[PDB]
Design a binder for this molecule. Structure first.
Ligand SMILES: Cc1cc([C@@H]2CN(C(=O)c3ccc(F)cc3)CC(F)(F)C2)n2ncnc2n1
Ligand SMILES: [Mg+2]
Ligand SMILES: [Zn+2]
Length: 341
């Protein structure tokens, strides 16, 4: 009933101009988590319209409205891996489109697949990682653990189940070859969100940036799509310090909750998921140094206009070192009590 009325307005009221969402909506400085959640499905439509994908691919507006709502409704509400994460990852894809001239690098359909993949790439996340699915002998591991990337295979399978839901296949008028192409792209792009995949291809990403992007090289296209998706996935770290701090809070709430579950199973959590061992400033510096900063350095090497993104991640990294001293309790706790000992 609720989705029906939301559908009715999304379809019949018209698509809001993207500039009416916010004066800075298309800037790397904009924080899409600032958008009220109730406004995000209309913002998805506005972005799709502004990138001309609705007209170029003749997407049926009722199908697209239903698709967007079905995708939003396909996310659960863990602290981090929720619909607002998918919305902000999708928004960053729109930023790359508006700021970095992707049409000089990628086919139209590849850019479209990236954006749709961003919307779908964490569908039905339960707030636990791939190792946990295997350790807990979850249904998802029973399905996919022999292939790896258990959660990401599930996210892709969930996106297909939405497309296979009557009235929701935004691609169903595509040619057979274009349809196969779109779903293949979605597979590769969603599967690239496994950071284990990113780490596997990282040297090939380095090699691509070194020799220089070849628009006629099909492997360069695939590699670039993977890097862009990862850049979208981690894009929370490219905003201000306030965003980085809040996003850290959400990640560790989620992580520590999984760690609490691992302990109740008799298993030793990773220290970054153990609330009794994790030292957040050191983990955030490590994550920025070894994972986040190299990704945006690569993005800058390929796209010089992405320099500000790398400098932001580097800045946020310096902020963690500056505030680290505040995790040590000097003097007495604010209650004047040593009871916590
Ligand atoms: C935007 C953003 C996203 C993530 C994570 C990274 N991540 C990992 O596997 C991972 C690997 C090494 C680490 F040191 C920490 C986490 C997968 C995920 F949890 F899905 C999202 N983090 N993590 C810390 N700050 C983050 N900021
Ligand atoms: Mg994911
Ligand atoms: Zn994600």
């Amino acid at each position: 009933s609720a989705m029906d009325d939301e559908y009715t307005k999304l379809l019949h009221d018209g698509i809001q101009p993207v500039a009416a969402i916010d004066s800075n909506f298309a800037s790397f400085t904009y924080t899409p988590r600032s958008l009220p959640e109730d406004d995000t499905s209309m913002a998805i439509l506005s972005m799709l319209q502004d990138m001309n994908f609705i007209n170029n691919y003749k997407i049926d507006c009722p199908t697209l409205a239903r698709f967007c709502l079905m995708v939003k409704k396909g996310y659960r509400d863990p602290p981090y891996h929720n619909w607002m994460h998918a919305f902000s990852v999708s928004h960053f894809c729109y930023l790359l489109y508006k700021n970095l001239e992707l049409t000089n690098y990628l086919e139209d359909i590849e850019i479209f697949a990236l954006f749709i993949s961003c919307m779908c790439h964490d569908l039905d996340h339960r707030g636990t990682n791939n190792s946990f699915q295997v350790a807990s002998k979850s249904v998802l591991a029973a399905l996919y653990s022999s292939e790896g990337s258990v959660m990401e295979r599930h996210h892709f399978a969930q996106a297909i189940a939405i497309l296979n839901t009557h009235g929701c296949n935004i691609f169903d008028h595509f040619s057979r070859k274009d349809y196969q192409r779109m779903l293949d792209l979605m597979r590769d792009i969603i599967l690239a969100t496994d950071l284990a995949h990113h780490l596997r291809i990282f040297k090939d990403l380095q090699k691509m940036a070194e020799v220089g992007y070849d628009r006629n090289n099909k492997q360069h296209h695939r590699l670039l799509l993977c890097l862009l998706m990862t850049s979208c996935d981690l894009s929370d770290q490219t905003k201000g310090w306030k965003t980085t701090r809040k996003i850290a809070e959400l990640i560790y709430k989620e992580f520590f909750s999984q760690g609490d579950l691992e302990k109740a199973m008799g298993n030793r959590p990773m220290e970054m998921m153990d609330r009794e061992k994790a030292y957040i400033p050191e983990l955030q510096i490590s994550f920025m140094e070894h994972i986040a900063m190299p990704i945006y350095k690569l993005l800058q090497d390929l796209f010089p206009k992405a320099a500000e993104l790398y400098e932001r991640v580097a800045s946020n990294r310096e902020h963690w070192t500056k505030v680290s001293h505040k995790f040590t309790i000097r003097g007495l706790p604010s209650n004047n009590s040593l009871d916590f000992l």
